[PDB]
Amino acid sequence: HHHMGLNTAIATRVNGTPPPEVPIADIELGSLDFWALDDDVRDGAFATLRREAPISFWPTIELPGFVTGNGHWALTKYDDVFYASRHPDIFSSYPNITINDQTPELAEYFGSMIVLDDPRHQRLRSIVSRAFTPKVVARIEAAVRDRAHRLVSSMIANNPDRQADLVSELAGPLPLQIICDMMGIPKADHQRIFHWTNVILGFGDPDLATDFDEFMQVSADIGAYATALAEDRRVNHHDDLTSSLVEAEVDGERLSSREIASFFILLVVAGNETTRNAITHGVLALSRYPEQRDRWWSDFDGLAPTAVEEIVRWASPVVYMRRTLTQDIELRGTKMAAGDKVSLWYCSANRDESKFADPWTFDLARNPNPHLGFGGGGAHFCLGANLARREIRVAFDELRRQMPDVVATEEPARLLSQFIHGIKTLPVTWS
Ligand code: HEM
Ligand SMILES: CC(C)CCC[C@@H](C)[C@H]1CC[C@H]2[C@@H]3CCC4=CC(=O)CC[C@]4(C)[C@H]3CC[C@]12C
């Protein structure tokens, strides 16, 4: 520090360091306050559970407007999360995939294929899945590239002090534009969409929304938007996913307005509130472990496949998904009852010491890397996984190309969420 100035790269950390030991008595998965604690507390809590109570029961976190809910069995081991994901006849995605349940009012907006089992779930998924296949994603690679390139160049041109928030200037707007363009949403409305999806998956964080009436107004507003755009596409076809939604028939039946709106919402919410956190956590990790940045930069194309997977394993942007038992089962000597909720902790599966060597090492060469960041596999395996991998790869490639020494200057402001491993802001600087 020879001169004081506006910033200083954040502290680095020793790669491979396990979290400080968290006593099992300190673990409060049913307290919102617990989810505000830093990753070291949270990661150490799940390490303790994997060792000492790998399946355990916790209460639902109550937020304003939430339906009173029974507790949930937390599956913290990789093998259990994998098994549960692969056996939906036992571990149903109905009636919901967060720990709390939907009100009847919310079902008008959130009753999509992600809270349905087969057969209906697969019939719905097939309406859009062609757009998400690798060969079709390849067609929009150039657009993903152009968006990332323009955003990083704008960071440089419009921040002459050479600092900016990575989330608002790259990590958020790159995946936002891509998924909204796939839906056919005009660019003028993308920021409106993003505000809505930020609220939908930010509820309970004071920086996003805590008033349930505001949450219900946002849900109604994005639903009305979806419906208005769908009515547009009913009269004038475009080559976008909203047109695919309104033109689809399942066994001779069009989708209802409810079904179209919830499908639209599912797609933009998932597209907007996942990859941005993989990217932001990735930049945080590069800032903490510069030897990993240096390695990747010296061989970007060679390491990119494994680097992208390790960023998803490290970030685990979706912390968990819920299921509901259709029958009694016993796992690890723990009897769970038909009708009980079960939570699949991907954040924990992705540190499981029985499955991953050196789990606390951010290793951009890690291979194989059978992480559960996109879920355990099975019927609901992330629809956007190919697209997310390309978004992540291109974001880091443009940072490497245009501002290779980009580094965080403050610790991230973390989203208060049990479900989404969100970073709200990440100030960065570059030369
Ligand atoms: C790094 C980024 C992402 C991560 C970590 C992620 C993670 C996940 C996870 C864990 C699931 C649940 C899987 C299961 O239950 O087995 C899921 C489902 C889903 N994701 Fe992704 N996701 C990401 C990006 C995206 C993107 C960009 C989209 C684009 C819209 C998307 C669309 C979907 C959809 C539609 C589903 C529901 C699939 C179904 O029910 O069949 N995801 N995702
Ligand atoms: C992260 C993606 C892969 C999946 C996105 C799923 C989105 C579209 C939907 C499906 C079920 C929805 C949840 C239903 C329960 C609920 C009730 C509330 O009062 C707050 C908002 C929440 C917590 C909803 C937030 C948005 C969810 C999670």
Coordinates of C-alpha atoms and ligand atoms in Angstrom, one line a residue:
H1 CA 0.0 0.0 0.0
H2 CA 2.3 2.8 -1.1
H3 CA -0.6 5.3 -1.6
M4 CA -4.1 5.3 -0.3
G5 CA -6.8 5.1 -3.0
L6 CA -10.2 3.9 -3.9
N7 CA -9.8 0.2 -3.4
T8 CA -7.6 -2.9 -2.9
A9 CA -8.1 -6.5 -4.1
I10 CA -9.8 -8.6 -1.4
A11 CA -7.8 -11.0 0.8
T12 CA -6.7 -14.2 -0.8
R13 CA -7.4 -17.5 0.9
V14 CA -5.4 -20.7 1.1
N15 CA -6.9 -23.1 -1.4
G16 CA -7.9 -26.5 0.1
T17 CA -8.6 -25.1 3.7
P18 CA -11.6 -26.9 5.3
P19 CA -14.1 -24.7 7.1
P20 CA -13.6 -24.2 10.8
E21 CA -15.4 -27.0 12.8
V22 CA -19.1 -26.1 13.4
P23 CA -20.5 -27.8 16.5
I24 CA -23.8 -29.6 15.7
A25 CA -25.5 -27.5 18.5
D26 CA -24.7 -24.3 16.5
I27 CA -26.5 -25.6 13.3
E28 CA -29.9 -23.9 12.9
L29 CA -31.2 -24.8 9.4
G30 CA -34.7 -23.7 10.5
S31 CA -33.6 -20.2 11.4
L32 CA -33.5 -17.5 8.7
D33 CA -30.7 -15.9 10.6
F34 CA -28.5 -19.0 10.0
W35 CA -28.7 -18.4 6.3
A36 CA -27.3 -14.9 6.6
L37 CA -24.0 -16.4 8.1
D38 CA -21.0 -16.6 5.8
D39 CA -20.1 -19.6 3.6
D40 CA -17.5 -20.9 6.1
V41 CA -20.2 -21.3 8.8
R42 CA -22.6 -22.8 6.3
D43 CA -20.1 -25.2 4.7
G44 CA -18.8 -26.2 8.1
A45 CA -22.4 -26.9 9.3
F46 CA -23.1 -29.2 6.4
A47 CA -19.7 -30.9 7.0
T48 CA -20.8 -31.6 10.6
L49 CA -24.1 -32.9 9.4
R50 CA -22.5 -35.2 6.8
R51 CA -20.3 -36.7 9.5
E52 CA -22.7 -36.8 12.5
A53 CA -26.3 -36.5 11.3
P54 CA -26.4 -37.1 7.5
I55 CA -30.2 -37.2 7.5
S56 CA -31.9 -35.0 10.0
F57 CA -35.3 -33.1 10.5
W58 CA -35.6 -29.3 10.5
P59 CA -38.6 -26.9 10.6
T60 CA -39.8 -24.7 7.6
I61 CA -38.6 -21.1 7.8
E62 CA -41.6 -18.9 8.1
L63 CA -41.6 -15.6 6.1
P64 CA -44.5 -13.1 5.9
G65 CA -47.3 -14.6 3.8
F66 CA -46.0 -18.1 4.0
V67 CA -48.3 -21.1 4.5
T68 CA -47.6 -22.9 7.8
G69 CA -45.5 -25.9 6.8
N70 CA -44.2 -29.2 8.3
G71 CA -40.5 -29.7 8.6
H72 CA -38.2 -31.5 6.2
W73 CA -35.6 -34.3 6.2
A74 CA -32.3 -32.8 5.0
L75 CA -30.3 -35.2 2.7
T76 CA -26.7 -34.0 3.0
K77 CA -24.9 -36.9 1.4
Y78 CA -24.1 -37.2 -2.3
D79 CA -25.3 -40.7 -2.6
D80 CA -28.7 -39.9 -1.0
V81 CA -29.3 -36.8 -3.1
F82 CA -28.4 -38.8 -6.2
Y83 CA -30.7 -41.6 -5.2
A84 CA -33.6 -39.3 -4.3
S85 CA -33.3 -37.5 -7.6
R86 CA -33.4 -40.7 -9.6
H87 CA -36.5 -42.1 -8.0
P88 CA -39.3 -39.6 -8.4
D89 CA -41.9 -42.3 -8.0
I90 CA -40.8 -42.2 -4.3
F91 CA -39.5 -38.6 -4.1
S92 CA -42.2 -36.5 -5.8
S93 CA -41.8 -33.0 -7.1
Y94 CA -45.5 -32.4 -6.3
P95 CA -46.7 -30.2 -4.7
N96 CA -43.7 -27.9 -4.6
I97 CA -39.9 -27.8 -4.8
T98 CA -39.1 -25.3 -2.1
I99 CA -39.6 -26.3 1.5
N100 CA -42.7 -24.1 2.0
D101 CA -45.8 -24.8 0.0
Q102 CA -47.7 -22.6 -2.6
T103 CA -51.0 -20.9 -1.8
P104 CA -53.8 -21.4 -4.3
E105 CA -53.1 -17.8 -5.5
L106 CA -49.5 -18.6 -6.2
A107 CA -50.4 -21.7 -8.1
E108 CA -51.7 -19.5 -10.9
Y109 CA -48.1 -18.3 -11.5
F110 CA -45.8 -21.1 -10.2
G111 CA -47.7 -24.3 -11.2
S112 CA -45.1 -25.2 -13.9
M113 CA -43.6 -28.5 -14.9
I114 CA -41.0 -28.2 -12.1
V115 CA -43.7 -29.0 -9.5
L116 CA -45.2 -31.8 -11.7
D117 CA -44.3 -35.4 -12.1
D118 CA -44.4 -37.4 -15.3
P119 CA -46.2 -38.0 -17.5
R120 CA -47.4 -34.4 -17.6
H121 CA -44.0 -32.9 -16.7
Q122 CA -42.3 -34.6 -19.7
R123 CA -45.0 -33.6 -22.1
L124 CA -44.5 -30.0 -21.0
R125 CA -40.7 -30.1 -21.2
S126 CA -40.7 -31.4 -24.7
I127 CA -42.4 -28.2 -25.9
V128 CA -39.2 -26.2 -25.4
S129 CA -36.4 -28.6 -25.0
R130 CA -35.2 -28.4 -28.7
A131 CA -34.2 -24.8 -28.1
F132 CA -32.0 -25.9 -25.3
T133 CA -30.1 -28.7 -27.0
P134 CA -26.3 -28.3 -27.6
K135 CA -26.7 -28.0 -31.4
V136 CA -29.3 -25.2 -31.1
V137 CA -27.4 -23.5 -28.3
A138 CA -24.4 -23.5 -30.7
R139 CA -26.5 -21.3 -33.0
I140 CA -26.7 -18.6 -30.4
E141 CA -23.1 -18.9 -29.2
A142 CA -22.3 -15.9 -31.3
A143 CA -25.0 -13.9 -29.6
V144 CA -23.8 -15.1 -26.2
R145 CA -20.3 -14.0 -27.2
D146 CA -21.4 -10.6 -28.5
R147 CA -23.4 -9.9 -25.4
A148 CA -20.5 -10.7 -23.1
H149 CA -18.1 -8.8 -25.2
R150 CA -20.2 -5.7 -25.3
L151 CA -20.9 -5.8 -21.6
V152 CA -17.2 -6.1 -20.6
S153 CA -16.2 -3.3 -23.1
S154 CA -18.9 -1.1 -21.6
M155 CA -17.5 -1.8 -18.1
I156 CA -14.2 -0.4 -19.3
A157 CA -15.6 2.6 -21.3
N158 CA -18.0 3.8 -18.6
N159 CA -16.0 3.3 -15.4
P160 CA -12.9 5.6 -15.8
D161 CA -12.0 5.0 -12.1
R162 CA -11.8 1.3 -13.2
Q163 CA -14.3 -0.1 -10.7
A164 CA -17.7 -1.5 -11.1
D165 CA -20.2 -3.9 -9.7
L166 CA -19.7 -7.2 -11.5
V167 CA -23.3 -8.3 -10.8
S168 CA -25.1 -5.3 -12.4
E169 CA -22.6 -4.8 -15.2
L170 CA -21.9 -8.4 -16.4
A171 CA -23.1 -11.4 -14.3
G172 CA -26.7 -10.3 -14.3
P173 CA -27.2 -8.7 -17.7
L174 CA -25.5 -11.4 -19.8
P175 CA -27.8 -14.3 -18.9
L176 CA -30.8 -11.9 -18.7
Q177 CA -30.5 -10.8 -22.3
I178 CA -29.9 -14.3 -23.6
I179 CA -32.9 -16.0 -21.9
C180 CA -35.2 -13.0 -22.6
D181 CA -34.2 -13.0 -26.3
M182 CA -34.9 -16.7 -26.5
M183 CA -38.4 -16.1 -25.1
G184 CA -39.0 -13.3 -27.6
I185 CA -39.3 -10.5 -25.0
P186 CA -38.4 -7.1 -26.5
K187 CA -35.1 -5.7 -25.2
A188 CA -37.0 -2.6 -23.8
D189 CA -38.6 -4.9 -21.2
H190 CA -35.6 -7.0 -20.1
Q191 CA -34.8 -4.9 -17.0
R192 CA -38.5 -5.0 -16.0
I193 CA -38.3 -8.9 -16.2
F194 CA -35.1 -8.9 -14.2
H195 CA -36.6 -6.8 -11.4
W196 CA -39.5 -9.2 -11.3
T197 CA -37.3 -12.3 -11.1
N198 CA -35.0 -10.7 -8.6
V199 CA -38.0 -10.2 -6.3
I200 CA -39.5 -13.7 -7.0
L201 CA -36.2 -15.4 -5.8
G202 CA -35.2 -12.6 -3.4
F203 CA -38.2 -12.7 -1.0
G204 CA -37.2 -12.4 2.6
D205 CA -34.0 -10.2 1.9
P206 CA -34.8 -6.6 2.9
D207 CA -32.7 -5.4 -0.1
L208 CA -35.1 -7.2 -2.5
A209 CA -38.6 -7.6 -0.8
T210 CA -40.1 -8.5 2.5
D211 CA -43.7 -7.4 2.0
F212 CA -45.9 -10.3 0.8
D213 CA -48.3 -7.9 -1.0
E214 CA -45.4 -6.7 -3.1
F215 CA -44.4 -10.2 -3.9
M216 CA -48.0 -11.0 -5.0
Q217 CA -48.1 -7.9 -7.1
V218 CA -44.8 -8.8 -8.8
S219 CA -46.1 -12.3 -9.5
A220 CA -49.4 -10.9 -10.9
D221 CA -47.4 -8.4 -13.0
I222 CA -45.0 -10.9 -14.6
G223 CA -47.9 -13.2 -15.2
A224 CA -49.9 -10.5 -17.0
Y225 CA -46.8 -9.6 -19.0
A226 CA -46.4 -13.3 -20.1
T227 CA -50.1 -13.5 -21.0
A228 CA -49.9 -10.2 -23.1
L229 CA -46.8 -11.4 -25.0
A230 CA -48.5 -14.8 -25.5
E231 CA -51.6 -13.1 -27.0
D232 CA -49.2 -11.2 -29.3
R233 CA -47.6 -14.5 -30.5
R234 CA -51.0 -16.1 -31.0
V235 CA -51.8 -13.7 -33.8
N236 CA -48.2 -13.1 -35.1
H237 CA -45.8 -16.1 -34.9
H238 CA -42.1 -15.3 -34.1
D239 CA -39.3 -17.8 -33.9
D240 CA -39.2 -17.6 -30.1
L241 CA -40.1 -19.8 -27.2
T242 CA -43.3 -17.8 -26.3
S243 CA -44.6 -18.7 -29.8
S244 CA -43.7 -22.4 -29.2
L245 CA -45.7 -22.2 -25.9
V246 CA -48.9 -20.8 -27.6
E247 CA -48.7 -23.1 -30.6
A248 CA -48.1 -26.3 -28.7
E249 CA -50.7 -29.1 -28.3
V250 CA -50.5 -32.0 -25.8
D251 CA -52.8 -34.8 -27.1
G252 CA -54.9 -32.2 -29.0
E253 CA -55.1 -29.7 -26.1
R254 CA -53.5 -26.3 -26.1
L255 CA -51.9 -25.1 -23.0
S256 CA -54.1 -23.0 -20.7
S257 CA -53.2 -19.4 -19.9
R258 CA -52.2 -20.5 -16.5
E259 CA -49.9 -23.1 -18.0
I260 CA -48.4 -20.7 -20.5
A261 CA -47.7 -18.0 -17.9
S262 CA -46.2 -20.4 -15.4
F263 CA -44.0 -21.9 -18.1
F264 CA -42.8 -18.4 -19.1
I265 CA -42.1 -17.5 -15.5
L266 CA -40.2 -20.7 -14.8
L267 CA -38.0 -20.1 -17.8
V268 CA -37.1 -16.4 -17.1
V269 CA -36.7 -17.0 -13.3
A270 CA -34.4 -20.0 -13.8
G271 CA -32.5 -18.2 -16.6
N272 CA -32.0 -15.0 -14.5
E273 CA -31.3 -16.2 -11.0
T274 CA -28.8 -19.0 -11.5
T275 CA -25.9 -18.4 -14.0
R276 CA -25.4 -14.9 -12.6
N277 CA -24.4 -16.4 -9.3
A278 CA -22.1 -19.1 -10.9
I279 CA -20.3 -16.2 -12.7
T280 CA -20.1 -14.0 -9.6
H281 CA -18.9 -16.8 -7.3
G282 CA -16.4 -17.8 -10.0
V283 CA -14.9 -14.3 -10.0
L284 CA -14.8 -14.3 -6.2
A285 CA -13.0 -17.6 -6.3
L286 CA -10.5 -16.4 -8.9
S287 CA -9.9 -13.4 -6.7
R288 CA -9.3 -15.6 -3.7
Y289 CA -7.1 -18.2 -5.5
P290 CA -5.0 -16.3 -8.1
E291 CA -3.0 -19.4 -8.9
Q292 CA -6.2 -20.9 -10.4
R293 CA -6.8 -17.7 -12.4
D294 CA -3.2 -17.8 -13.7
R295 CA -3.5 -21.4 -14.7
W296 CA -6.8 -20.9 -16.6
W297 CA -5.5 -17.8 -18.3
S298 CA -2.4 -19.6 -19.5
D299 CA -4.6 -22.2 -21.3
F300 CA -8.1 -20.9 -21.6
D301 CA -9.6 -23.3 -24.2
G302 CA -7.8 -26.3 -22.8
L303 CA -9.0 -25.8 -19.2
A304 CA -12.4 -24.3 -19.9
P305 CA -14.5 -27.5 -19.8
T306 CA -13.3 -28.5 -16.4
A307 CA -13.1 -24.9 -15.2
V308 CA -16.7 -24.3 -15.9
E309 CA -17.8 -27.5 -14.1
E310 CA -15.7 -26.6 -11.1
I311 CA -17.2 -23.1 -10.9
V312 CA -20.7 -24.8 -10.8
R313 CA -19.6 -27.3 -8.1
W314 CA -17.9 -24.5 -6.1
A315 CA -20.8 -22.0 -6.4
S316 CA -23.7 -24.5 -6.2
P317 CA -26.1 -21.7 -7.3
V318 CA -29.2 -23.7 -6.4
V319 CA -28.6 -24.7 -2.7
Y320 CA -31.3 -27.4 -2.5
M321 CA -34.5 -28.7 -4.0
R322 CA -37.4 -30.2 -2.1
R323 CA -39.3 -33.5 -2.7
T324 CA -42.3 -35.1 -1.0
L325 CA -42.4 -38.8 -0.1
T326 CA -45.1 -40.9 -1.7
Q327 CA -44.3 -43.9 0.7
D328 CA -42.4 -44.7 3.8
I329 CA -38.7 -45.2 3.3
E330 CA -35.6 -45.8 5.4
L331 CA -32.3 -44.3 4.4
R332 CA -29.1 -44.5 6.6
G333 CA -31.2 -46.1 9.4
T334 CA -33.6 -43.0 9.4
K335 CA -37.2 -43.9 8.8
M336 CA -39.1 -41.2 6.8
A337 CA -42.9 -41.3 6.5
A338 CA -45.1 -41.1 3.4
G339 CA -46.0 -37.4 2.9
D340 CA -42.8 -36.1 4.6
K341 CA -40.8 -33.3 2.9
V342 CA -37.2 -34.2 1.9
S343 CA -34.6 -31.5 1.0
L344 CA -31.8 -32.4 -1.4
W345 CA -28.8 -30.2 -0.3
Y346 CA -26.7 -29.8 -3.5
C347 CA -24.4 -27.4 -1.6
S348 CA -23.5 -30.3 0.7
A349 CA -23.4 -33.1 -1.9
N350 CA -20.8 -31.0 -3.7
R351 CA -18.5 -31.1 -0.7
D352 CA -19.1 -34.7 0.2
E353 CA -15.8 -36.2 1.4
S354 CA -17.0 -39.7 0.6
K355 CA -17.3 -38.7 -3.1
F356 CA -14.9 -35.9 -3.9
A357 CA -11.2 -35.9 -3.3
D358 CA -9.8 -32.6 -2.0
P359 CA -13.4 -31.2 -1.7
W360 CA -12.3 -27.9 -0.3
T361 CA -9.9 -27.2 -3.2
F362 CA -11.1 -25.0 -6.0
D363 CA -9.4 -27.1 -8.8
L364 CA -10.1 -25.8 -12.3
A365 CA -8.6 -29.0 -13.7
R366 CA -10.8 -31.3 -11.6
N367 CA -11.8 -34.3 -13.8
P368 CA -14.0 -36.2 -13.4
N369 CA -16.3 -33.8 -11.6
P370 CA -19.7 -35.5 -11.1
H371 CA -21.1 -32.5 -9.2
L372 CA -24.8 -32.1 -8.5
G373 CA -24.9 -28.4 -9.2
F374 CA -27.5 -29.0 -11.9
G375 CA -29.3 -31.6 -9.7
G376 CA -28.8 -35.3 -9.1
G377 CA -30.0 -36.3 -12.6
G378 CA -33.3 -37.8 -13.5
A379 CA -36.5 -36.4 -14.9
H380 CA -35.9 -32.7 -14.0
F381 CA -32.2 -32.4 -14.8
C382 CA -31.5 -28.7 -15.4
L383 CA -33.0 -27.7 -18.8
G384 CA -30.6 -24.8 -19.1
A385 CA -27.4 -26.7 -18.3
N386 CA -25.8 -26.4 -21.8
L387 CA -26.8 -22.8 -22.0
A388 CA -25.5 -22.0 -18.6
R389 CA -22.1 -23.6 -19.4
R390 CA -21.8 -21.5 -22.5
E391 CA -22.7 -18.3 -20.6
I392 CA -20.2 -19.0 -17.9
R393 CA -17.4 -19.9 -20.4
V394 CA -17.9 -16.8 -22.5
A395 CA -18.1 -14.5 -19.5
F396 CA -14.8 -15.6 -18.2
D397 CA -13.3 -15.6 -21.7
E398 CA -14.3 -11.9 -22.2
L399 CA -12.9 -11.0 -18.8
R400 CA -9.6 -12.7 -19.7
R401 CA -9.5 -11.0 -23.0
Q402 CA -10.3 -7.4 -21.9
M403 CA -9.5 -7.1 -18.2
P404 CA -7.4 -10.2 -17.3
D405 CA -6.6 -8.9 -13.8
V406 CA -10.2 -8.2 -12.8
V407 CA -10.5 -8.8 -9.0
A408 CA -13.0 -8.3 -6.3
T409 CA -12.4 -5.3 -4.1
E410 CA -15.0 -6.0 -1.3
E411 CA -16.4 -9.2 0.1
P412 CA -19.8 -9.9 -1.6
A413 CA -23.1 -8.8 -0.2
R414 CA -24.9 -12.2 0.1
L415 CA -28.5 -12.7 -0.7
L416 CA -30.5 -13.7 2.3
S417 CA -31.8 -17.0 0.9
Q418 CA -32.0 -20.7 1.8
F419 CA -32.6 -21.7 -1.8
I420 CA -30.4 -19.5 -4.1
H421 CA -26.6 -19.0 -3.4
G422 CA -27.0 -15.4 -4.4
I423 CA -24.5 -12.6 -4.5
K424 CA -26.3 -9.2 -4.7
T425 CA -23.2 -7.0 -5.5
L426 CA -19.5 -7.7 -6.1
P427 CA -17.3 -4.6 -6.6
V428 CA -14.3 -5.4 -8.9
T429 CA -11.4 -3.4 -10.2
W430 CA -9.0 -3.9 -13.2
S431 CA -6.0 -2.3 -14.9
Ligands
HEM1 C1 -25.3 -22.4 -13.5 C2 -26.6 -22.2 -13.8 C3 -27.8 -23.1 -13.3 C4 -27.9 -24.0 -12.3 C5 -26.8 -24.3 -11.2 C6 -29.2 -24.6 -12.4 C7 -29.6 -25.6 -11.5 C8 -30.8 -26.3 -11.6 C9 -31.3 -27.3 -10.7 C10 -30.5 -27.8 -9.5 C11 -32.5 -27.7 -11.2 C12 -33.3 -28.8 -10.5 C13 -32.9 -30.2 -11.0 C14 -33.6 -31.4 -10.4 O1 -34.6 -31.2 -9.8 O2 -33.2 -32.5 -10.7 C15 -32.8 -27.0 -12.4 C16 -33.9 -27.1 -13.2 C17 -34.3 -26.3 -14.2 N1 -33.5 -25.3 -14.8 FE1 -31.5 -24.9 -14.3 N2 -29.8 -24.1 -13.5 C18 -29.0 -23.2 -14.1 C19 -29.3 -22.5 -15.2 C20 -30.5 -22.5 -15.9 C21 -30.8 -21.6 -17.0 C22 -29.9 -20.5 -17.6 C23 -32.0 -21.9 -17.4 C24 -32.7 -21.2 -18.6 C25 -34.0 -20.9 -18.5 C26 -32.5 -23.1 -16.6 C27 -33.7 -23.7 -16.7 C28 -34.2 -24.7 -15.8 C29 -35.5 -25.4 -15.9 C30 -36.6 -25.0 -16.9 C31 -35.5 -26.3 -14.9 C32 -36.7 -27.2 -14.6 C33 -36.5 -28.5 -15.4 C34 -37.7 -29.5 -15.2 O3 -38.5 -29.5 -14.2 O4 -37.7 -30.5 -16.1 N3 -31.5 -23.4 -15.7 N4 -31.8 -26.1 -12.6
LIG2 C1 -33.8 -21.9 -9.5 C2 -34.5 -22.5 -10.7 C3 -33.7 -23.7 -11.3 C4 -36.0 -22.9 -10.4 C5 -36.9 -21.7 -10.3 C6 -38.3 -22.1 -9.7 C7 -39.3 -20.9 -9.6 C8 -39.8 -20.6 -11.0 C9 -40.5 -21.2 -8.6 C10 -41.0 -22.6 -8.5 C11 -41.7 -22.7 -7.1 C12 -41.6 -21.2 -6.6 C13 -41.8 -20.9 -5.1 C14 -43.1 -21.4 -4.6 C15 -43.1 -21.1 -3.1 C16 -42.9 -19.7 -2.8 C17 -43.8 -19.0 -2.0 C18 -43.6 -17.6 -1.5 O1 -44.4 -17.0 -0.9 C19 -42.3 -17.0 -1.9 C20 -41.8 -17.5 -3.3 C21 -41.7 -19.0 -3.4 C22 -40.5 -19.5 -2.6 C23 -41.6 -19.4 -4.9 C24 -40.4 -18.8 -5.5 C25 -40.3 -19.2 -7.0 C26 -40.3 -20.7 -7.2 C27 -39.1 -21.4 -6.6

